[model samples]
Target: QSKSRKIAILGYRSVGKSSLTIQFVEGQFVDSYDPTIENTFTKLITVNGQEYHLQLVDTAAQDEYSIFPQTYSIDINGYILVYSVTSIKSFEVIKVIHGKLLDMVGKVQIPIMLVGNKKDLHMERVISYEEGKALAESWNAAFLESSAKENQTAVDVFKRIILEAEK
Candidate 1:
């Protein structure tokens, strides 16, 4: 139902990329800290009324490891660029990560979806919703706000990927 498609969860280290993986897997949304370990997982899912088998690669791939202290890797036929709404730095890094992904891959065929995570703490939001949405429009990237601790869009995140890939 899918290729050996890899979805790299790229973002600043403390931005809960690992937590998203767990949320995506077990449907448990814990707004706690996770070790900075890169891991991988797989899930068979359907998006936009179609069935698909997704390889949801958690953390970053080898290229992501090499990116520390220096930008290095990119993966997936698509990207789910995650940034926490409570962290300005996290939002700022979105630029670098997206830029680097394009620079490394050198192509526009790949899809990118911008996810503003941690919406549960909307009161503590450091980045405004419109700002994020505007950025998505500017980049022509799909956008979604996910309070994974409650209204988890874990599966929907990948579902959006399937939608993008089908394009």
Candidate 2:
């Protein structure tokens, strides 16, 4: 039997959080910035000899609080926090989002990853990998640089999150 896990992708608007999640699950990149609104994805696969049915919740930085208005609560087992290296605003917003998540959960024990996405646009990268890594270190979260547009490190992102969850 496979265990069900609820993982959320949280980030600033147009930060490519949804794009990366789509690439991981669907194996296809959505290059357009006009991504779908808050949505959940159920992807089933085995990693490290364990079967998991991942329910990936992709949401905007602000809208996730009300992801399910009726339920009025978010049950997230892990988090994949994404930001575009090309946008300093995105980098800053993720920290703010991270703060809110910590407050909401009342703990920092969950698996949290800080991803600097859009490495394919390296020329325009405003947030350096070293800076991102430093921030992740400060927050006790894992960090990775990736580009869903180029399909680079897409699988690793998902795999890493699973490892984080399992660990």
Candidate 3:
């Protein structure tokens, strides 16, 4: 049987959460807001020569002090916390969510992928890549910048989390 991974994508509103999720699962960048899209998606893929059935959960936008659901922590293999490069506020929101996650999952190290998305909008970026990398390093989590519009590092985001989970 193939390994199964359950991952959640969390960040602030309009931070390209659904864009990144759709790109990884459907290989297309959907620009408009579509309420009809499924929140949970399943995909079979290969990473590092191993097969995986990924259950990607695209959750609602998070804010500081928001109640993180038990389902997000329980039975979850890994997490991908996303932020938009154009919005520094979104990055700060990620930091809060990261702490909340640790509080939920305990003090132990969890498989976390901190993703800086919307890299294609480089000209509008308020948060730098180095800043994102440094934050991830501080938390001992994996980091990657992605452009869902261009399909850049979209696949790698999921693969990196798989690597982290299997580590």
Candidate 4:
């Protein structure tokens, strides 16, 4: 039997979590106005000749809003922690989200990738690639930059996470 992988796409509000997932899953992007009231989930995705089942959980942008409301009980094999490269605060918030994941899953090691989204906006870059990489390295996580607007690395980010998870 083929092994099934569960991957979660998580980030703060307006960090392009929904945009990345939509672009990766549907190959089409739609502008979203409302924050995710509840978590959204997707199914089987074939990447790099491997089958992966992705369950993307998107919570409200408000930090006061607890993720417990949107949380689903599942064994996550990997995680994609996204942050907007144009927003330093978003990048910093990854640490908090990382802690939350640990609280939810207990003290277990899981493959995580730090994704600096909105790479197409070079002129508005607030966080440097080196900064992202350094942060990921500190957390023992891999890092990559992607542009969901241009559908760049949308699928590749998750594929890389899965590859790392197998190690």
What's each prediction's TM-score?
A: 0.83, 0.86, 0.92, 0.83
lDDT tens readout by residue for model 2, 11-82: 878888888888888888875654557788888878778888889888755533433232214467788889
lDDT of 3 at 144: 95
Cα-based lDDT for every prediction = 0.72, 0.79, 0.85, 0.77
Over the stretch 72-163, how does candidate 1's per-residue lDDT look in tens digits? 34455777888899989888888777777767766547788898888778588999889889999998889988766643477777777667
Model 4 deviation from native, Cα RMSD in Å: 2.8
- Residue-pair clashes per candidate, as listed? 0, 0, 0, 0
lDDT at residue 55 of model 2 (Cα atoms)? 90
Q: Model 1 residue 14 lDDT?
A: 61
User: Candidate 4 at 88: error in angstroms?
Assistant: 1.5
Between candidates 2 and 3, name the one with more favorable TM-score: 3
Off by over 4 Å in 2: 33-36, 61-74, 150-152
Model 4 / residue 78 / CA error / Å: 2.0
Per-residue accuracy of model 3 over 33-52 as CA lDDT, tens digit each: 65334488999998767789
The superposed Cα distance between candidate 1 and the true structure at residue 154, in angstroms, equals 1.8
lDDT of 1: 0.72
- Between candidates 2 and 4, name the one with more favorable lDDT: 2
